[PDB]
Amino acid sequence: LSTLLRLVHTDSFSCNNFDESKIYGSCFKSIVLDKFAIPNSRRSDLQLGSSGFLQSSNYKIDTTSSSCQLYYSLPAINVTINNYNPSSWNRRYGFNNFNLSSHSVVYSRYCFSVNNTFCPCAKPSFASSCKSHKPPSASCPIGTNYRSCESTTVLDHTDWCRCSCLPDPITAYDPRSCSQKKSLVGVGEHCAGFGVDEEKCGVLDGSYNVSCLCSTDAFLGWSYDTCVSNNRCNIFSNFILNGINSGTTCSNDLLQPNTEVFTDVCVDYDLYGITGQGIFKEVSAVYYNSWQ
């Protein structure tokens, strides 16, 4: 660990539920390393315990076990960020790459979880009989649940149709009437997916000949921010242990280094588990094999 902190420029290093001094001279059976970039605006949200966006939608650090945190830096001259959305249902209906800018990281602001029956599509026959505020309708693949839209009678209007998830899933008036529900990620998994605006998904007057594709503006709940500071990028890493004083993986710092030999001087040697005393003299040999 000393060589790791020396070679890689370490800005901060702490450990929760464990002592840093106890790491020197111990053996851990396994170590899990979770690393990701640090946003400049929301860096303070990386504290141990906070109701921030990073801990509630991107990655949460469990405090019920002994772990360690390391904030380090890296020269921003050769830093590239590969963005991806770990959402299945969002990518299924036509999600693509962000392609915003370089040296920028995207953090999710809201997380929504759905079951295996949701579809950002309304019923064509139901949406056709809506002369006022007709929602867009299209066809869904085999097996889903279309948008719940009902036509309610008014004083003079008889074609006023309402739907669910209005106006937006972030500020929905009735969350219980919408299919997608806001969920909080725990420890181990990723974000379920971004928000989906049903008003911007699909086309108008579709005779079951087009899938449910949402525009790029229909996805909400994320923000991009730069990560350049003093021509460098800050990266956070979390080391999770799996056992104390048990495991083949130990610390090499608490061992005996490989010193330099000395000729024509009486020296005490500890060569290959065999101890003794004597003088060393350099000579040319050819009878030494690989294992000998």
């Binding site: 505020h133 004083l155 106006p167 008036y173 219980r176």
Partner: protein, 236 residues
């Protein structure tokens, strides 16, 4: 009224029941023993007649409703600026022959003075004989509940009441639903607690559904018409 608790006797001593054809059809509110406030759309033709009506006061239950009630029903007064296709100025005044004697559980509500600085999200009470099912069947006891006043600029959103709210119209209830009025609550008194004094600021006009989401209540703004009410005081 859906999702409301039973009203104990001597709690809302201003519930006046208007019964036509020997059955209660609409409610009302009493401010003075000579005038009763009710809905104007329910008093239209051919029901716009001085006779064929009955006023009941102090009836804590529908079981006691039988032969024998208050004074005779006089002529009805409607706002000339009211319309049928467009809901506007839905206020009606009913006159009685004999004055309403103030009994033990009888207390008229006070008219709202022009200028009160009402809270935007203020808790108010709605009491009457409503329903708790699909359009209901009848109502045998008083049902009362509490609601909130939705903002005018928020209730007329493009998804609920786009261009369907007049300056003399307010919304009471919950946006999520499950608490609202239903069919049969014509003239439901909308009273609020301000400085330990109850004020009547709303009047049931119409609605969509019963205790449903995205469909708040609809009430009339009496404060605009209060002066017109005083006009009736200048008439009789």
């Amino acid at each position: 009224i859906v999702g409301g608790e039973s009203a104990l006797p001597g709690a809302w001593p201003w519930q006046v029941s208007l019964h036509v054809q020997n059955v209660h059809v609409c409610g009302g509110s009493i401010i003075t023993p000579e005038w009763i406030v009710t809905a104007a759309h329910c008093v239209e033709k051919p029901l716009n007649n001085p006779w064929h009506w009955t006023a009941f006061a102090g009836i804590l239950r529908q079981s006691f409703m039988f032969y024998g009630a208050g004074y005779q029903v006089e002529k009805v007064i409607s706002h000339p600026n009211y319309d049928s296709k467009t809901k506007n100025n839905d206020i009606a005044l009913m006159k009685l022959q004999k004055p309403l004697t103030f009994n033990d559980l009888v207390k008229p509500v006070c008219l709202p003075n022009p200028g009160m600085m009402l809270q935007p999200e203020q808790l108010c009470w709605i009491s009457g004989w409503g329903a708790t099912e699909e359009k209901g069947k009848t109502s045998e006891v008083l049902n009362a509940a509490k609601v909130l006043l939705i903002e005018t600029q928020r209730c007329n959103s493009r998804y609920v009441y786009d261009n369907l709210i007049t300056p003399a119209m307010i919304c009471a209830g919950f946006l999520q639903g499950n608490v609202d009025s239903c069919q049969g609550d014509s003239g439901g008194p909308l009273v609020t607690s301000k400085n330990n004094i109850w004020w009547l600021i709303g009047d049931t006009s119409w609605g969509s559904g019963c205790a449903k989401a995205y469909r708040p209540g609809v009430y009339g703004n009496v404060m605009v018409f209060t002066d017109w009410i005083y006009r009736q005081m200048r008439a009789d």
